[model samples]
Target: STGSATTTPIDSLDDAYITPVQIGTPAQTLNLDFDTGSSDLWVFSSETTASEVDGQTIYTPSKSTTAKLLSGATWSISYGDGSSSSGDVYTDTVSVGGLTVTGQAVESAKKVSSSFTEDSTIDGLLGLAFSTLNTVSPTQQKTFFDNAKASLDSPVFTADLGYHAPGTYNFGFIDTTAYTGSITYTAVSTKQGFWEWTSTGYAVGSGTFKSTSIDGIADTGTTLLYLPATVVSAYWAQVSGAKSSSSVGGYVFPCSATLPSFTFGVGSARIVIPGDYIDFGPISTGSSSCFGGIQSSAGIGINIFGDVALKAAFVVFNGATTPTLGFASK
Candidate 1:
């Protein structure tokens, strides 16, 4: 799964937000979000102009005796959502969970809006996916994991996602108690940085429907699993009187009955999607119908195996050590 870190407006509030894994010491705690779509670590700062941001955490470097700004090199990032933030770059000692990593490059926003300025809960974001997407320039850049890999007992990172509840997303080591048996790891395509595999066929319940060939990538940052349009429509056709509804916007079916179990072939691995995901609704007009877990991504050049697929398997993003990805049963 690919994680992303980008600037966005946070609601005005003073609630206690989760603190990010720090990079330096026992006392300093920098709050951050865990993103897989993009690789970069950033934080909000007090030096930011209040007019430029909507809602975000403001970092006060002067308050931190250990903070060091990297010259005056400024940085900015725009997300798919169209929101953006610009800030000055700096190097600092950060700490997360009890581990400390020094010389970490982080962006501190200088101009932000009231939305972000008003919030006291949010702090920053942490990128824990692949190193390829990191914002660090090849000439001079260091990742959060690149610096702390040596301190971790096991050179591994695990993300325990909590969609509705407080999620436990851990980095640096795999919690053996959270999983069972040996992990069934698949080799990642070194060139693409995506999890690629061939699908054997589609199955509903215990019945083998039809063999559909496909190659795809899994991204936890994305909410839904996207597939080829042809494949999605064919699968929907098998349902008895499965009519699309607009409850979820579109593609929502009546909760009259549970849909059949659908599984995709990933080489020798068979990943299954329960019936609940098929009842997805639409996001908007012209927007691909959100068919529960599977949507149409035909001709999009890539298949995204989003959270739906990740929840079904225990994923290990091993970028800090070997360039490998491990998959196991949760």
Candidate 2:
């Protein structure tokens, strides 16, 4: 069976993408961030500390008849930004779109970082990465994708993130009408539990395409594109007043700067990100400095092709015996 769900950007900057998920027997609906960088399906629930529960929707496990506590199981995860969460576990009926999975492990958050509380729209995260990265101890739980893959017509999912519009996430089958031309597949290394792949090269706007290998992970969870310092510097140099700001953090430029589009190659397919997409938006409400969607990955050690890059093309996260990534122009 195949399933499809609509994913919307929660902010104007496309800072995060969320899709509605149904959990438990009665099916408590909550909007969740679909993260490809991590493996753990967690939510804000009755188990969450009252102080940490802001305006986000809470998943009440006690209210669900099918919710069963996973005795002695616990989970904790820390993101690259230091934002973290930890909680107990329960198995419940989980569904996305029309796809259903019985006894899917649902982590109930006991604590969450300030950043999560500050962002009230995202109630929780639905991890799509390999289940090997699951933080659950005693017994690591499988992701929603893993559990439902057997019933699906195809064992894969596709991410079509929009810049400011609502996009679609499809499971089991690829939508031929969703992309143009043909898809180019590249071998992916899931050794670290991420959909890691190497890109052919990149170019700033219509400039010369640099033929080099750039290894990175396709993370829909991350908002910005992080490349090597050399690549990031080369792109920023083309802009008039762009500079790496220490206080402001990351590369920022005048809001009115004439930015160029970015292009990266996958196999022989070239995906171009519009210039406006790179102009992340004003750093502050009344500030003239706007942040760049592309930043240096020097601090992270590994390059990351996040939403900024994913939004420009159709991405296929294949979960076959040998995992591979497929890219196509949209």
Candidate 3:
């Protein structure tokens, strides 16, 4: 089972959450976020001070028999939210599930933010997004896919996010049973860490959004599904007496009734978003109550299908031969 065992609180970090995962035959743990934005697996180190490393998972090299530090090398990464971290490099014999892969180079951030410190639930992020975003050099950089590629019984890695429940995310071999035949394969653009796509249109309770014929990108790093304003307003229009609330920055309808079924089109694929996602409520002041599923990107030329949307599909990121993304049942 790829599901988490326990979820720990990472102090004041609002979105930071930690879950236990088996790294090898022996039980091991790492901190992780279900980020759909960038793909880089990293962890905070014990060498960092409490103040410098906020709500992140701290990795103890002493605990690992095979942990090795990368001498004279430094690493850093930044998120779309402008949060950034920088530190030295290290190598470790890491384990995930029953699979044990040695010589895994990981970033050990020394400086972090209060948000990361407050949310030190998981030790670090287990990046399943893409390799282009990797912080490691080609000679030293190794992704979960690169390390496990040769050993994997199958050619694909599947990401299954359990919606509200603690869901399992599995790798190694592709489970054919979990998916319906005829998987939709999309050619991945050789871009940066961001997985961008074009959207044909969106469907909300049988209503369609304008500019749905455009192509957009699907990113695992973002939390919100950012779309064109026209499409977003059209979506809210179908909520049947849906009224905008000031308490929420985006769009929020009465939670008393179920919202309409919503789906987005990617080529021929009609991806659906559940009603619970539509009623995500508001995050802060000026934020709409309908903060979860759909939102307005305004002038942002690219539309991002954040984690909320990606979770609905069984996504496979194949970095072995040719960079390709395959979608199946979730």
Candidate 4:
């Protein structure tokens, strides 16, 4: 069996993509970030305190007859940005799009960070990474993808992310019509529980191509594309007034500056990000300086091909014994 769901951007910056996920027997639908970087299907629920809750829809296990508490099970997870959540675990009927999982592990959030509370559009997060990254104690839980892969027509899922538009996520099959040309497949390393892979090289706008392999992860959860310090500097240098500012954080450029596009190689295929996409809007309301979509990953420890990169291509997350990632022009 296969499943298909539409993912919508949460804000103008395309910070994250959210999809509808139905939890519990009667089905409480909540829009959640389909984060590929983390591995835990958690949600804001009745267990969460009123003070911690904001405008998000909560999952009430008490309303579902099929809900069952997983005694002694708990989970706590933190993101790269420092936002975190921790809570108890429950098993219930969970469904995404048309696919169903009878006993999916749904972590109920009892405590959440202020960042989560401030984001009213995101109810919680649905992790699509490997089960090894799951923070559940006593027993690490498999991700929704891993649990559903065995029953799918094919053991794979695909992400078609859009810039300022709605996209689609397909489980078990790839939508042939969604992309152009042939796909480029590359070996994936799950050693760190991420969709980590190596890029052949990159080019600044239409300039000379640098033949340097960069290790990175395909993270839908992240907003910007982060590469090596050298590559990042090269791209920013092309912009007229681009500057790396510590006070403002990362690279920022004049709002009226002409920006250069960025292109990265996935095997023989190259995905190009339009220059306009790099202008990540002003640093502050009515500010003349704008933030950049690409930044240096040196401080972050690992390179990240986040939404800024994924929105430029059709990506496939294959879950075979020898896992591989596929990228196609779209």
Candidate 5:
């Protein structure tokens, strides 16, 4: 017998995809964003000051007999875009899909920034990155996947994200049926606590593939693709009126311009981001100006293969001895 579970993407949010998670002794369920960018499982909680919490579902530690505070423990995290959360730590049973991980460190958020509080649909975050990246103080905590991997049939999980559509996340097994063509593999460099991989090069529109070695992280948490400015400039230059303008939030272009597809290489395997997908959406109410989902990673230092890139392909985050990533066209 083996353990495995499947997750369906929530249809409510335009940015992040969420999964239902059960925690505590008798399982209190919450819809949490599964963020691969960071490693800390924190949730909105009853302990949060009254004014800090809004309509989000609060995780009451007291209600779960199995939930226990780790004495003197704390965790705080801030996203790349400034959303932040901090809280005390608790050890409890946390389950996702059909896998149950006992005594998992569940950070119950007592404080949150407006970025987090305003999002009512997201009750928490389930981090799927490396355990070393966990934010728990005193001692690092393991992710639920880390606790469950030892017993899984084939230490692996696959993320299948669709463009404004529901998709499935599978653990412990890969459903061959979810993707088409052969799955191409990449050796992951995990030093950054992310699913970090290098691309042989990339191609913009129907142009030649740029053989520039690009190292980046596959971050499900980020809604936009953050690439090097040189690459970003190259892509946007194709559009008639695209510019890296702060007023428009990023590279903005005329909504009616004929967009081109962007493609990148993962070794011999390649993933293409359709030109339309690059046009994130309108910048303002009924405006013809649109923001480019692909932006400059100039200040950020490392390129980020965010949701804009991931949703275009089926990705496998291998949890075996040598963590590998596999990608296939949907």
Candidate 6:
């Protein structure tokens, strides 16, 4: 009874995982980043300013016979990093993984910030978060999942983020084969329209998981793992030549450093993130300088278990009355 789909990553900028989505009557497929932190499916369109479009593909509503204009409907979205987009709305058939959502609200962007425009690979973004977080005025729009969950056998989706390997976002059903061993389930608070939860503890190097609760959100849209200043400082102290350099934008260390894996608690389970992945490659290719993937969430009050942290496990976003998150080592 569930409609399931596999989210395939096309090209990523080390921040997002782009998945293919078909929109309108004839199926104009575009690569979109699936973001749980946002709730608007805005794409680069013919209405976008020519200069701001860069080299990305544009969605043309006029070309789609099934596309309907949503009278007076408009939307605007602003990301935490200041990247934003705004546009008028259209109702059309949006499909992913053979699952079709009829009369889906597709906001086409008329303008985009430099941060969004610079990402030339993706055509747009598909929000996977709750509809409560939608930014449309007059009336909010439902996300793809929100519109489709009613017809699903179970209201659950899974996020399997990977390093250089292929990863997928499975919908409506949990694929047990994708992960190994038992999963750890933790209660999630959707009051803020985010999969927010608390980690029971964390440890540095070979140290045991300490005793502390750290509140954080599991966000696929974010690239790095963000933690409180206190925890960030403690982790950096163990690394030689590690410093919070504003010029470099975060904690940067020498590439030669043999960094230790990081461990964080979830209920009674501990998820470990490998040290090499924490290196986050080089600040620039062909350079000995590297940036630490785990950094302080200074201005951002909440910790973010972003791609760097989520890649180590298979995560579940259960859309039940009391939303919960399930994690397992992959």
Q: Between candidates 2 and 4, which one is better according to lDDT?
A: 2
Model 5 alpha-carbon miss at residue 288, Å: 1.6
lDDT of 6: 0.85
CA RMSD, predictions in order: 6.3, 0.6, 4.3, 0.7, 1.7, 1.6
Per-residue alpha-carbon lDDT of candidate 3 for residues 109-169, written as tens digits (9 for 90 to 100): 6777655565545556656556667765534465665676677765466655545544444
lDDT, residue 16, model 1: 15
lDDT of each: 0.56, 0.94, 0.60, 0.93, 0.86, 0.85
Task: Assess candidate 5 and give its TM-score to the true structure.
Answer: 0.95
Candidate 5, poorest ten consecutive residues by summed lDDT: 1-10
- What lDDT tens digits, residue by residue, belong to model 4 across residues 148-233? 99999999999999989999999999899999998999999999999999999999988988888999999999999999999999
Q: TM-score of every model?
A: 0.72, 0.99, 0.81, 0.99, 0.95, 0.95
Superposition-based RMSD of candidate 6 using all C-alpha atoms, in angstroms: 1.6
Error of 2 at 129 (Å): 1.0
Clashing pairs in 4: none
Q: Residue by residue across 78-129, what tens digits does model 6's lDDT show?
A: 9877889999999999988777889999999999999888988789989988
True-structure lDDT of candidate 3:
0.60
Give the Å error, residue 295, model 4.
0.7
Identify the runs in model 2 with alpha carbons over 4 angstroms from their true place. Answer: none
- Residue-pair clashes per prediction, in order, are 46, 0, 44, 0, 0, 0
TM-score of 3: 0.81
lDDT winner between 1 and 3, please give it. 3
Model 5 lDDT tens row, 67-169 = 9999999999988897888989999998887778889999999899998888777899999999999989989999878888887778998888877777777
Candidates 4 and 5 compared: the better one by lDDT is 4
After TM-score superposition, the amount by which residue 183's alpha carbon in candidate 3 deviates from its true location, in angstroms, is: 2.1
